Ligand binder design. Structure first.
Ligand code: CLA
Ligand code: CLA
Ligand code: CLA
Ligand code: CLA
Ligand code: CLA
Ligand code: CLA
Ligand code: CLA
Ligand code: CLA
Ligand SMILES: CC1=C(/C=C/C(C)=C/C=C/C(C)=C\C=C\C=C(C)\C=C\C=C(C)\C=C\C2=C(C)CCCC2(C)C)C(C)(C)CCC1
Ligand SMILES: CC1=C(/C=C/C(C)=C/C=C\C(C)=C/C=C/C=C(C)/C=C/C=C(C)/C=C/C2=C(C)CCCC2(C)C)C(C)(C)CCC1
Ligand SMILES: CC1=C(C/C=C(\C)CCC[C@H](C)CCC[C@@H](C)CCCC(C)C)C(=O)c2ccccc2C1=O
Lengths: 154, 165, 42, 166, 62, 728, 48
């Protein structure tokens, strides 16, 4: 409800330009609609869509003039998450690749002699080398801030 | 294995706050009966009182909390600590943190500390499996039953995600 | 089999191979929850 | 600079190292293979053969309904969750016995010998009683359906052309 | 005493440099500036590497 | 055996106890090549047809698709029956994230992406008919790859194979002619007469669908074809001794084309493919072999001399026998236009039925079928180099015709260099004028048709004569050898037009003199850098850096781009500027001034105007009216099925773009860089050991070449496309 | 992508939330968002 941008439910545009945009693919009477492939340009799909119409709805995004999702989190109201509730994971999903990324490498001086010892990967991964990826920060993310860094290692 | 006697207490602390944590909503736990996602508070009460919201039960009872917890912290740090239950030892006889302050930089070892029975420890973690049952339902299926000879292992119904909420 | 181990690698198409036979899954998920638009927590 | 030369087997060219192949399988624990391949379908040596029977169920087929518990979508797809977690922990840590523990990197004895090795007729006891059974789950291999969307292997069946005609 | 140890490189000349260990060999032949023979396992824009050294340098730890 | 890598391969110093990234494109950038292999033929001849292998096993691996993905989902049937309106389609695509609309739904009961490049027209040409059919030829050719790829293993491997009887060169050069053309040409006639001819002649009206005379018929017993074009079919073929005249009926030089749908006659293609068939069967015995009949191999060439041009053209090489590289220009320049020849030929005078009228392949095809050609020749004689700097051994030559050039360099190249001003510089410097003379330059007086005219004119030429050519003069054939040339004797069909008298003039001795130009200063680049290349009059000694070899001196005050490898590194760009020109001129003739439509009162009506004539004189006229007058197609063109060409040249413009970044850029600048970052990994211990160095000079005159040169292509194929179809 | 593949409905256009604050306090009174100052009676826009 903030800055504009209305929650979709007053429908004005979006919902209609929608029930327009998608719905002249629908005028695909211009073929023969029964069973097809070769055609189904009409009947289905709209299932994902129109039979997801008033569905999408539904949490607002306060989709806005034009009548489309102006997608915003910034840390106000329910939204504090339309990208943050799915905004952290990414952080999470990446830099523990860094762990594998690190400990894969930080092995590539152990057992001794290295590099292409980088090309032949010694199938490097599946558990703790990754499956620590699971559990890094605020329990041990300060794998950073002691003996591994510094750095302090040799 | 994994690592060194780093946190014990941290997770111990956790397991301390744990059982009586899962004792907390363990009132909704229903002696026999009185539950749901909660609002109230032990019994009674009726002074003047413990209140809302230009008051909150929060900041009053939980500012002062701070010095009650920092004492431990700095107590850990500069040991510091009883004689000695929690950091660490006197009686009798838990799972040993075992080590002393340093390594070869770190590893002159690191973990020969297993051994025994069922024992003391255990229940500390029990309540976090409790939790990962007890949290998961309560917004997914917000009441806790158990029911034999009736329709356990039969069911009845269904209930998924998108309904709505 | 072992042991972490190591284990044994292979040559030039592993970082690659990763794209396909596993990474695809994505499009399954992206099918499974058709599109995303934004956050579905459970 | 080893060796390499040697490196190998240590040279080359041109032959018998031999260890040898390549071009098929297989050196280390090509026995995890062994130890996996017996069990996996010795297991199966008891799914379809019960089946390959039931068609013939002389006088009455089977019957069992429940006597357990009966309501709103009741019983068995729940399910493998319980059933094949139980037999889950079964599979796993019987056969971490390709060696096995970490050779890769209380007491001791029992039994007497070397996996009470053998005996040297019982090595033969396991033999192709172990293998010929996976010769015969090659019958499995070749569908293991016989219902080839095949109608067909009914009215039960199965077989049985011999081959009549007309 | 340190013949080819984990010893450093330290002069506004080099390529690798801070990069540590290795004095491999050291001569006894005086003239030059180049007594300190270094070989690691990391390389400049040659491939053979190892070029030589000495004097206003080894400002290092163990 | 053997094998396998691992470090080190062929670039001697490959393993190097590594040290740096940038080996992974020294190997990816050596790998095939030789001398950085060996000319030791007993292991290089036995690579080239090893090959040469897969390429086919790949070509097979190819074609075996273009029928499975024809005959697993037709537009073939669901159209064939009805050419005309309702047209091509060979791919329909899974329902992921909005793929869909990419498979249109516009083809006669078919959802699917529409298709440019005959095929429908290639297989309605023979006949085949039935999806379960050239699907019965999808399997014909896929293992059928197999065995041909089962030749890798055939010889070489268990069979280190033979240069002794590779070197020689007479059986094969005779047999290709006979041998494996000659299994062909005419043994496509047996096909082109019996299979092909009438399952077309009787297609040419009735025979709508399903009862489709499965080729199965017409062997052992005749009667039917007999019931058709006769020949008297007893068991005695006249022309065994000169009743030729009769078994004719259905093959007198018909020329023109089938006005009941363009193409041009199959009644006009056995006489073409049993004559040019057998010359190649006979004329594919003229050389030695064993049985005492034949010619010189080379013994012919030193046959003749001439005073200057001395020795003549004499004793013609002995690696020309041996191996590839030496040879390797000629099979390309040749094959070269042998894909600009068939081009300027195909559209030029239609094969398989359903072209002339078509478009989206009396263009489309036309191109590519000119890229491959341009591409091919305009990178053919980077094989003249290598060779000198390579496969050429000690001696064989001096007084050779060869050397007669290498001496006469500097003053052979040179006298092109000037044409390559005049021809161009000023003959392109010539739209320019008429811009300065249309903007500034008032029709009053300047270079266009009712302008620097040139009244009748330009003729015609000839061509025209090409139109008195069949009415006498080459007695007959039929109808004017190709409607494109001639007078006003004019056809078409299918409402829209087909080919007509495409008349030239101003707009015609213009443009042209650009292809006429270009293919001057696009060779000599080429010749300059093909002659000097090993001896260059200004680093004189080259074979001292390799084939590629970057530049050299910051000295002599600016020695770079010396290599032919880099004479080739821009050898191309222009081609693209030249092939990726010329296409253009084409697609605004075909159209605007050839394609049609129909209405009626004497009036053909083209895709665009008889514009062109005087609004493609001036340079500009090709953005006024060749862009923003077009592109509309692609500019808007989203939410649709033009929904790829609104999606390609996007990330085709970028990736014309993301060239210059690697191509205008520095190289030391970049290496200089990949520390800095380095500090992050390292100090924080991550960092490689394949020391991540920054891409090797040549290597990035090996990307803004590819990338530029991927970029402005798709783009124009993202573009030219979607123009054609709806205003197509 | 979408905008091409009939799908503008779904779309990643995340609308600026920040500059946003400015341009109102610095005066601008154009729709929504019940905060102070430009309130067209507000206590940074007062005292002055
Ligand atoms: C989709 C998905 C995917 C496939 C990616 C992928 C990526 N994101 Mg990303 N991101 C996403 C969703 C996604 N993101 C979402 C929803 C957000 C919230 C707005 C972000 C906010 C974000 C930020 C702030 C950054 C990235 C960055 C990156 C890149 C990381 C480079 C790197 O070192 O990390 C992979 C490996 C590690 C070891 C870490 C990588 C391309 C970063 C980047 O560009 O360079 C680091 C950084 O800019 N993302
Ligand atoms: C380019 C070649 C091509 C090929 C590969 C064939 C192949 C064939 N023709 Mg044929 N044919 C061709 C062009 C071709 N023809 C042309 C241009 C004509 C018109 C003259 C014919 C007129 C023709 C007739 C009338 C017949 C054949 C027949 C045949 C078949 C059997 C001949 C035989 O048994 O040997 C016998 C050898 C002799 C010398 C007699 C054989 C499949 C015959 C057939 O269908 O059944 C056997 C039939 O006789 N053909
Ligand atoms: C007869 C034809 C055809 C064939 C079989 C070859 C074959 C060869 N060419 Mg070649 N070439 C051709 C047409 C052909 N070319 C044309 C038309 C051109 C002009 C564009 C060139 C320009 C060319 C150059 C400049 C070079 C070659 C080189 C080579 C050799 C190594 C190429 C390689 O795989 O390196 C591996 C490189 C890659 C895989 C990178 C290419 C990019 C990929 C990803 C596509 C190999 C003998 C090289 C050579 O002879 O060594 C000195 C090299 O100098 N070619
Ligand atoms: C008048 C018209 C004009 C304005 C020009 C102008 C020019 N001609 Mg030219 N030319 C013309 C008619 C004209 N020509 C005609 C009618 C013919 C014969 C049909 C030629 C045959 C000709 C040749 C062969 C050459 C020129 C060249 C040139 C250029 C001279 C060199 C230079 O300026 O750099 C110059 C642009 C020369 C050139 O391009 O490089 C020297 C070249 O030598 N012209
Ligand atoms: C839009 C154009 C721009 C212009 C105006 C020119 C103009 C010219 N180029 Mg050129 N060129 C360009 C971009 C341009 N180039 C680009 C981007 C490349 C790299 C693809 C080249 C690569 C190139 C080569 C290799 C050569 C030329 C040559 C020439 C000259 C031929 C005679 C002429 O027409 O003079 C009228 C002005 C001419 C000066 C040639 C030359 O001068 O012959 C010796 C020849 O060497 N150019
Ligand atoms: C504001 C501008 C913008 C910019 C920076 C560009 C830039 C480019 N466009 Mg482009 N374009 C634009 C707007 C722009 N365009 C618009 C608004 C349209 C119509 C909506 C087009 C329609 C268009 C088409 C059809 C093509 C390009 C191509 C190109 C590239 C030319 C590549 C080349 O080397 O051959 C240029 C060499 C020539 C000889 C051009 C001759 C042109 C005249 C004299 C005839 C270049 C990246 C093309 C390409 O990559 O291949 C040729 C081609 O695909 N554009
Ligand atoms: C790290 C920086 C990168 C950079 C250089 C910028 C730069 C900018 N952002 Mg921005 N932004 C970023 C990441 C970045 N952003 C990310 C990751 C998000 C996640 C949602 C946003 C969300 C955002 C919004 C809503 C707006 C801007 C705006 C702006 C502009 C004005 C100042 C501002 O509002 O930014 C503040 C930037 C940050 C707080 C980035 C924090 C550093 C993190 C990423 C570490 C400025 C050009 C505004 C604007 O000018 O509109 C016209 C406003 O619209 N940004
Ligand atoms: C018209 C005149 C004059 C006056 C009366 C004010 C008054 C004000 N300005 Mg201000 N300002 C002025 C000229 C003036 N400004 C000029 C010329 C500039 C440009 C240099 C600014 C740039 C400016 C900025 C960037 C901000 C203000 C803000 C403010 C407000 C303080 C908000 C607050 O948190 O309360 C606190 C009230 C106090 C009296 C301070 C506490 C001290 C007590 C304890 C004594 C206040 C109403 C702030 C604002 O608008 O809201 C956050 C904001 O920081 N001004
Ligand atoms: C970050 C990220 C990403 C991104 C991506 C992107 C965004 C891209 C784009 C890019 C761009 C921005 C552009 C590009 C484009 C492409 C292209 C462009 C291709 C091509 C091609 C081809 C292969 C072709 C060929 C051809 C021929 C045959 C001839 C004629 C023409 C043509 C072209 C057709 C990814 C996903 C990776 C992953 C994750 C993250
Ligand atoms: C408090 C505050 C804030 C902040 C601000 C800022 C912006 C500041 C500055 C600050 C500082 C003072 C900073 C610094 C930082 C640092 C860093 C450093 C970051 C990061 C990082 C990184 C780079 C990482 C890495 C890693 C890790 C660590 C983990 C994962 C993996 C890896 C290894 C990759 C805010 C916003 C709320 C506002 C108010 C106040
Ligand atoms: C950018 C640039 C480089 C540096 C470019 C390099 C080193 C190419 C990068 C190679 C690839 C892309 C490695 C990057 C990582 C990838 C292998 C894959 C990771 C990314 C995802 C797909 C997972 C040059 O060397 C150069 C040389 C001469 C003139 C201009 C330039 C120039 O412009």
């Amino acid at each position: 409800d903030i800055a504009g941008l209305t929650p979709c439910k007053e429908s004005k545009q979006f919902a209609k330009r929608e029930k327009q945009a998608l719905k002249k693919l629908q005028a695909s009477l211009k073929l023969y609609a029964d069973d097809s492939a070769p055609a189904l340009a009409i009947k289905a799909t709209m299932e994902k869509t129109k039979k997801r119409f008033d569905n999408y709805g539904k949490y607002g995004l306060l989709c806005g003039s034009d009548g489309l999702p102006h997608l915003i989190v910034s840390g106000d109201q329910r939204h504090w998450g339309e990208f943050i509730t799915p905004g952290i994971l990414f952080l999470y999903i990446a830099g523990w690749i860094g762990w594998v990324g690190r400990s894969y490498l930080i092995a590539i001086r152990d057992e001794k002699k290295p590099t292409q010892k980088e090309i032949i990967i010694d199938v490097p991964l599946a558990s703790s080398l990754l499956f620590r990826g699971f559990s890094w920060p605020v329990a041990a993310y300060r794998e950073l801030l002691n003996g591994e860094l510094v750095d302090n290692n040799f | 294995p994994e690592n060194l006697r780093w946190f014990v207490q941290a997770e111990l602390v956790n397991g301390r706050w744990a059982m009586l944590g899962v004792a907390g909503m363990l009132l909704p736990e229903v002696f026999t009966s009185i539950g749901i996602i909660n609002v109230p508070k032990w019994y009674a009460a009726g002074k003047e009182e413990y209140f809302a919201s230009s008051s909150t039960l929060f900041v009053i009872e939980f500012i002062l909390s701070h010095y009650v917890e920092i004492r431990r912290w700095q107590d850990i740090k500069n040991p510091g600590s009883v004689n000695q239950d929690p950091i660490f030892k006197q009686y009798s006889l838990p799972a040993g943190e075992v080590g002393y302050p340093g390594g070869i930089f770190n590893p002159l070892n690191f973990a020969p500390t297993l051994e025994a029975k069922e024992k003391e420890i255990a229940n500390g973690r029990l309540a976090m499996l409790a939790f990962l049952g007890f949290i998961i339902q309560h917004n997914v299926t917000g009441k806790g039953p158990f029911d034999n000879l009736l329709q356990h292992i039969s069911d009845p119904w269904h209930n998924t995600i998108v309904q709505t909420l | 089999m072992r042991d972490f181990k190591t284990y044994l690698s292979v040559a030039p198409v592993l970082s690659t191979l990763w794209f396909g036979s596993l990474a695809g899954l994505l499009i399954e998920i992206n099918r499974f929850f058709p599109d995303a638009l934004t956050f579905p927590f459970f | 600079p080893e060796w390499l030369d040697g490196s190998l087997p240590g040279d080359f060219g041109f032959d018998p190292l031999g260890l040898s192949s390549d071009p098929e399988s297989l050196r280390w624990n090509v026995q995890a293979e062994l130890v996996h391949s017996r069990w996996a379908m010795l297991g199966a040596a008891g799914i379809f053969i019960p089946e390959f029977l039931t068609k013939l169920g002389i006088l009455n087929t089977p019957s069992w309904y429940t006597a357990g518990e009966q309501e709103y979508f009741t019983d068995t797809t729940t399910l493998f969750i319980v059933e094949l977690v139980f037999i889950g922990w079964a599979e796993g840590r019987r056969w971490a016995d390709i060696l096995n523990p970490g050779c890769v990197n209380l007491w001791f004895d029992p039994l007497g010998w070397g996996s009470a090795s053998p005996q040297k007729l019982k090595e033969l006891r396991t033999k192709e009683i172990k293998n010929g059974r996976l010769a015969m789950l090659a019958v499995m291999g070749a569908w293991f359906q016989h219902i080839y969307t095949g109608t067909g292997p009914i009215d039960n069946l199965f077989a049985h052309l011999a081959d009549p005609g007309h | 005493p340190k013949r080819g140890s984990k010893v450093k490189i330290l002069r506004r000349e080099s390529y690798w440099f801070k990069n540590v260990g290795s004095v491999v060999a050291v001569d006894q032949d005086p003239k030059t500036r180049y007594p300190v023979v270094v070989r690691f396992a990391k390389v400049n824009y040659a491939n053979i590497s190892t070029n030589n050294y000495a004097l206003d340098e080894v400002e290092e730890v163990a | 055996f053997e094998q396998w890598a691992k470090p080190g391969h062929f670039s001697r110093t490959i393993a190097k106890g590594p040290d740096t990234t940038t080996w992974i494109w020294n190997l990816h950038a050596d790998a095939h090549d030789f001398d950085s292999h060996t000319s030791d033929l007993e292991e290089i001849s036995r690579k080239v047809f090893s090959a040469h292998f897969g390429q086919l096993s790949i070509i097979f691996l190819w074609l075996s698709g273009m029928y499975f993905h024809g005959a697993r989902f037709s537009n073939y049937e669901a159209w064939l029956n009805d050419p005309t309106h309702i047209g091509p389609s060979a791919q329909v695509v899974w329902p992921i994230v909005g793929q869909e609309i990419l498979n249109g739904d516009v083809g006669g009961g078919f959802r699917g992406i529409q298709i440019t490049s005959g095929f429908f027209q290639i297989w309605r040409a023979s006949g085949i008919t039935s999806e379960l059919q050239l699907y019965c030829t999808a399997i014909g050719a896929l293992v059928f790859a197999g065995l041909m790829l089962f030749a890798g293993w055939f010889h070489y491997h268990k069979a280190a194979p033979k240069l002794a009887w590779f070197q020689d060169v007479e059986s094969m050069l005779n047999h290709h002619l006979a041998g494996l053309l000659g299994l062909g040409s005419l043994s496509w006639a047996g096909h082109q007469v019996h299979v092909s001819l009438p399952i077309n002649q009787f297609l040419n009206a009735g025979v709508d669908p399903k009862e489709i005379p499965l080729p199965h018929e017409f062997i052992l017993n005749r009667d039917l074809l007999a019931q058709l074009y006769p020949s008297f079919a007893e068991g005695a073929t006249p022309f065994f001794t000169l009743n030729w005249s009769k078994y004719a009926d259905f093959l007198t030089f018909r020329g023109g084309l089938d006005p009941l749908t363009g193409g041009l006659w199959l009644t006009d293609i056995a006489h073409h493919h049993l004559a040019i068939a057998i010359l190649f069967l006979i004329a594919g015995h003229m050389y030695r072999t064993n049985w005492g009949i034949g010619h010189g191999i080379k013994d012919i060439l030193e046959a003749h001399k001439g005073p200057f041009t001395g020795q003549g053209h004499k004793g013609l090489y002995e690696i020309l026998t041996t191996s590839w590289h030496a040879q390797l220009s000629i099979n390309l320049a040749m094959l070269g236009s042998l894909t600009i020849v068939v081009a300027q030929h195909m559209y030029s005078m239609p094969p398989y039925p359903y072209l002339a009228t078509d478009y989206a392949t009396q263009l489309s095809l036309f191109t590519h079928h000119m890229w491959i050609g341009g591409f091919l020749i305009v990178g053919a004689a980077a094989h003249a180099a290598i060779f000198m700097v390579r496969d050429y051994d000690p001696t064989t030559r001096y007084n050779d015709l060869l050397d007669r050039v290498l001496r006469h360099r500097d003053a052979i190249i040179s006298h092109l260099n000037w044409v390559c001003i005049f021809l161009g510089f000023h003959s392109f410097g010539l739209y320019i004028h008429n811009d300065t003379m249309s903007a500034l330059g008032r029709p009053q007086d300047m270079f266009s048709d009712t302008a620097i005219q040139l009244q009748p004119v330009f003729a015609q030429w000839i061509q025209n004569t090409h139109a008195l050519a069949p009415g006498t003069t080459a007695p007959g054939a039929t109808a004017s050898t190709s409607l494109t040339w001639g007078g006003g004797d004019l056809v078409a069909v299918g409402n829209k037009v087909a080919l007509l008298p495409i008349p030239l003039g101003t707009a015609d001795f213009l443009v042209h003199h650009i292809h006429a130009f270009t293919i001057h200063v696009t060779v000599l680049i080429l010749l300059k850098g093909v002659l000097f290349a090993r001896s260059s009059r200004l680093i004189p000694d080259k074979a001292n850096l390799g084939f590629r070899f970057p530049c050299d001196g910051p000295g002599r005050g600016g020695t770079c781009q010396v290599s032919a490898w880099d004479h080739v590194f821009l050898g191309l760009f222009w081609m693209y500027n030249s092939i990726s020109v010329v296409i253009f001129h084409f697609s605004w003739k075909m159209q605007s001034d050839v394609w049609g439509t129909i209405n009626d009162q004497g009036v053909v009506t083209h895709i665009t105007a008889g514009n062109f004539a005087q609004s493609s004189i001036t340079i500009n006229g090709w953005l006024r009216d060749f862009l923003w007058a077009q592109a509309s197609q692609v500019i808007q063109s989203y939410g649709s099925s033009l929904s790829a060409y609104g999606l390609f040249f996007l990330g085709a413009h970028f990736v014309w773009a993301f060239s210059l970044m690697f191509l205008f850029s520095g190289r030391g600048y970049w290496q200089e860089l990949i520390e800095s970052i380095v500090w992050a990994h390292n100090k924080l211990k991550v960092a490689p050991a394949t020391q991540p160095r920054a891409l090797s000079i040549v290597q990035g005159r090996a990307v803004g070449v590819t990338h530029y040169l991927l970029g402005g292509i798709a783009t124009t194929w993202a573009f030219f496309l979607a123009r054609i179809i709806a205003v197509g | 992508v979408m905008l091409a593949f009939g799908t503008p409905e779904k779309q990643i256009l995340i609308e600026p939330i920040f500059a946003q604050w400015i341009q109102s306090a610095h005066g601008k009174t154009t729709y929504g968002f019940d905060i102070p100052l430009s309130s067209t009676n507000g206590p940074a826009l007062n005292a002055g």
